[PDB]
Structure 1
Amino acid sequence: GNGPITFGSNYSDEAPKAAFASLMQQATTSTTVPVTVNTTDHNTFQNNISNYLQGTPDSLATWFAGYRLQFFAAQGLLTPIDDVWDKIGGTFNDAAKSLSKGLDGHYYLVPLYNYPWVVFYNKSVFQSKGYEVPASWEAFIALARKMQSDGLVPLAFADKDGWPALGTFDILNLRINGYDYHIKLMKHEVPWTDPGVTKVFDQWRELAAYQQKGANGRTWQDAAKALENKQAGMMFQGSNQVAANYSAKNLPDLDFFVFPAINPQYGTDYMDAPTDGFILPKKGKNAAAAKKVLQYIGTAEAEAAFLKTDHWDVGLANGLIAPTYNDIQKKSVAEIGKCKSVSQFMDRDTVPDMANAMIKLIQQFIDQPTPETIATVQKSAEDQAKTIFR
């Protein structure tokens, strides 16, 4: 199993595309397996994952862990990878293992890295403008009002990509309602008409007046650019996005704080911290060689190689002393590890059709964040949920 492999990739942005290419360079060197990467625009790759897997997919592919893995593993679209994990199993922890498995208990994913969803800011700006890190909702709101009166956009905000605003719902839910409630909702074991969801949208109505206007017309990269260019005070997203988008020259000025506490019952106990990894499509060619590349991917060595170029994510291997780490990465390890539990992200944690319904409903909330809209959102979400989860 040394013959050439094909690798489908959603790393279409410059910085993560380059990081992946560097991993494949090293993967070919050590395994001997020639690899040809086929890249597709990020969103359209996940938007067409079904036809992709059912058609003539590549030997291996970039994908996501948790429910977003299970949903397509359940369809028989993926080759199980228990043989690979027999070799690499000792390298990963229980949390990474359960995220890597289908509903059937079998492995389908090799994971590579983790990252946090947190509020990013520029240290020099907080310093020079006398902004203090906010521990609580009230302090957060006060700070955003101070930014506003300073002539700044308080929170840079983008939702043209559809998924980014799901992160705000997640974190509001996790802060107000907690983790167990959030996963219930994702599994539709609690309805979208539930008063806890109303509370989420109600909190968001206060937050919305400090979020960048025109957000439904904005790519997340342009939001991250406004932060990096100091036109905005902070931005809530994943480090995989914001810190990958920063110049390497500017990255040392980047820092974050976890989303402030709202409800003392849940403090800052929880966050979204997505794991990314790789699958082996059932209809891909050369599975023998592909597993050899996967076995390599699932090592500390490979994660270290990878993190010489990726400076924004955090490796998952147990022994990992990949000493490249900057301050963003170190704080990521610590703050993630502090959480009692970590969810993935809405579109990774629920049925894709349900996430797609929410993506649109939340865009419509962004444009008209009134109690009227919130009522329609809950009823529409709950109606579509009853169909999807039947």
Structure 2
Amino acid sequence: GNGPITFGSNYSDEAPKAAFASLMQQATTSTTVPVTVNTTDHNTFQNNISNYLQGTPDSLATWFAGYRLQFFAAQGLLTPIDDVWDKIGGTFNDAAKSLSKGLDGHYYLVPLYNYPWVVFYNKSVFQSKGYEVPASWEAFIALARKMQSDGLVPLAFADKDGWPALGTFDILNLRINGYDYHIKLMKHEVPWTDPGVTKVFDQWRELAAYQQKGANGRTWQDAAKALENKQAGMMFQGSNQVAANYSAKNLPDLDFFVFPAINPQYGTDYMDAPTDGFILPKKGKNAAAAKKVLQYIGTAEAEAAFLKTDHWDVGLANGLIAPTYNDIQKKSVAEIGKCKSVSQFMERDTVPDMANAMIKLIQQFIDQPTPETIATVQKSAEDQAKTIFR
């Protein structure tokens, strides 16, 4: 019941590979279970996942919350871990529990860390110009308008990379229609022609008045540099992007606020906070020992250990403020922990083909944000969805 397990790992980059190796040494010291880490190139591992689970997988593997976790669990490829959760459940909130379950209500994932998609700004600028953090869409638009009058681009914005704008779609949908609807849309339980989608794009027509021009030709780093150089007042994106891009000298001035409330029914209850974790392949060997290792992974100590050298991701364990966290991380723990549910970014909440189809359609909207373009986007997205989810 304690024999060596194997661990399939997509941590191929130097820093996380070293952190994961150290973490497994700590796991063995605690649980007695020895571990062999089988590392595969990150992208390759992702690309081979279904074939991997169906072949002769490792005892445990790295994965993450979202559509594919639920797809594999639905398919019978994953061992449920309700037993692990009987031991570790007290450490996690409702959002953490939700993102760890399959459609059938069993647990399949042990999560480790996430990071937030939120609106960044410079504290010194807000202090100097008399800008207040907006809780509501009305205050947000009023602030954007004040910024324009002050000669500042309100929202630095970039989408040459294709994926950044998906975050704006997600947050508008979570704020207008709510989490349950957003996930239904992701799963194609609601069609892209649904009026809730029209309402998202209608809201974006307003927002786009305050978004940086030339976005489709701009890299996200160039938008982040605009914020850093004080040429823009705010920028909405992931903290492991915007904050990571800041120089060490300017990072002290960086802060963020959650995207403002639009429909008070959903307040600011939801956020894209992509969450990485671990699964137990049904076809893996030595399940009993693998479960002991998962129990260890589902602790504050495990999260703090892995995250020592990670400057942006934060643990999901209740009350964990690791001694290595910076100010951005401390606020991230607080703001992510307040959410009732967290989504995982469009690329992980729907199938890849569907997210990729939306990239181009959203660029088309950005190029011409009109009612006719919205109708075109909705029809094109729904037709793509019918082919993808067949």
CA distance in 2 between counterparts of 1:231 and 1:14 reads: 34
Aligned residues: 390
After superposition, the Cα gap between the structure-2 partners of 1:238 and 1:44, relative to the gap in structure 1 and judged at 3 Å, is farther
Deviation at 1:158, TM superposition (A): 3.7
Deviation at 1:170, TM superposition (A): 1.5
The range that moved more, 254-263 or 287-296, is: 287-296
**Relative to 1, partners in 2 of residues 1:219 and 1:108: Cα closer, same or farther, differing over 3 Å?**
farther
Shift of 1:112: 1.0
Percent identity at matched positions? 100
- Per the TM alignment, residue 198 of structure 1 is displaced from its structure 2 partner at its CA by 1.3
SS in 2 for 1:78: coil
The change in CA–CA distance for 1:25 and 1:62 in structure 2 (over 3 A counts) is same
Distance 2:163 2:22 in 1: 27
The answer to whether the 8 Å contact 1:68/1:352 transfers is no
Q: Does structure 2 retain, via aligned residues, the 8 Å contact 1:3–1:286?
A: yes
Paired residues of 1:137 and 1:261 also in contact (CA < 8 A): yes
Residue 200 (structure 1) shift: 1.1
Structure 1 residues 293 and 224: alpha-carbon distance in aligned structure 2, compared to 1, 3 A threshold: farther
> CA 1:14 to 1:176, structure 2 compared with 1: closer, same or farther past 3 Å?
farther
Aligned-residue offset at 1:219: 5.0
Distance in 2 (CA, whole Å) between partners of 1:365 and 1:186 is 19
1:114 is displaced (CA, Å) by 3.5
Tell me, yes or no, if the aligned pair for 1:118 and 1:236 is still in contact at 8 Å: yes
Q: Distance in 1 between matches of 2:31 and 2:148?
A: 54
Supply the distance in 2 between the matched residues of 1:248 and 1:30 (Cα, whole angstroms): 36
CA distance in 2, matches of 1:116, 1:209: 25
Hey, what does 2:247 align to over in structure 1?
Answer: 247
1:287 Cα deviation from its structure 2 partner:
5.9
Cα 1:144–1:96 shift into 2, 3 Å: same
User: Are 1:115 and 2:115 an aligned pair?
Assistant: yes
Please name the residue that 2:152 is paired with.
Answer: 152
The 1:193/1:255 distance shift into structure 2, 3 A limit, reads: same
* CA pair 107-382 structure 1, distance change in 2 beyond 3 A: same
The Cα shift of 1:341 comes to 4.2
Deviation at 1:37, TM superposition (A): 6.1
The answer to whether the 8 A contact 1:112-1:316 is kept is yes
TM superposition shift of 1:27: 4.3
SS in 2 for 1:225: helix
Structure 1 residue 378: Cα displacement: 0.6
C-alpha distance in structure 2 between counterparts of 1:284 and 1:270, whole Å = 34
Matched-pair contact (CA < 8 Å) for 2:88–2:298:
yes
Q: Deviations over 1:200-239 (max 9, x none)?
A: 1122123234334554455545544543454443221233
Deviations 1:74-123 (A, max 9, x none): 23443444454454344334432332222344332111124332111221
- TM-superposed deviation, 1:379: 0.9
Return 5+ residue gaps in structure 2 as ranges. Answer: none
1:16/1:75 CA distance change after superposition, 3 Å = same
Distance (Å, rounded) in 2 between the aligned partners of 1:277 and 1:151: 44
Task: Kindly indicate whether the alpha-carbon contact (under 8 Å) linking 1:179 and 1:270 is maintained by their aligned counterparts in 2.
Answer: yes
Change (3 A) 1:193 1:110: same
Residue 172 of structure 1 deviates from its aligned partner by: 0.9
Say if 1:282 and 1:267 are closer, same or farther in 2 by CA, change over 3 A.
Answer: closer
Listed as ranges, the gaps of 5+ residues in structure 1 are none
CA distance 1:175–1:319, shift in 2 (3 Å): closer
TM-score by length of 1: 0.80
Shift in alpha-carbon separation, 1:28–1:258, aligned structure 2, 3 A: same
Q: Deviations over 1:141-169 (max 9, x none)?
A: 34335545656543233445543322211
Contact 1:15 1:245 in 2 (8 A): no
Match of 1:20 in 2: 20
Q: 1:203 to 1:60 in 2, by over 3 A?
A: same
How far apart in 2 are the matches of 1:178 and 1:246?
Answer: 32
C-alpha spacing 1:267/1:104, structure 2 compared with 1 (3 Å): closer
SS at match of 2:210: coil
Contact 2:94–2:340 (8 Å) recurs in 1: no
SS of the residue aligned with 2:324? coil
For residues 213 and 38 of structure 1, the distance between their equivalents in structure 2, rounded to whole angstroms, comes to 46
1:272: how far off? 2.5
Change in Cα spacing, 1:253 to 1:28, as seen in structure 2 (3 Å) is farther
Q: Measured at CA, do residues 221 and 311 of structure 1 come closer, stay the same or move farther in structure 2, by a change above 3 Å?
A: same
Deviation at 1:296, TM superposition (A): 2.5
Query: Contact 2:316 / 2:333 at 8 angstroms: preserved in 1?
Result: no
Give RMSD over aligned pairs: 3.8
Report which stretch shifted further, 161-170 or 144-153. Answer: 144-153
| Counterparts in 2 of 1:379 and 1:257: CA distance versus 1, 3 Å | same
TM-score computed with the length of structure 2 as normaliser: 0.80
Distance 1:9 1:209, change over 3 A: farther
Kindly state the Cα deviation for residue 326 of structure 1 after the two structures are TM-superposed.
4.0
Q: 1:183 matched to which residue of 2?
A: 183
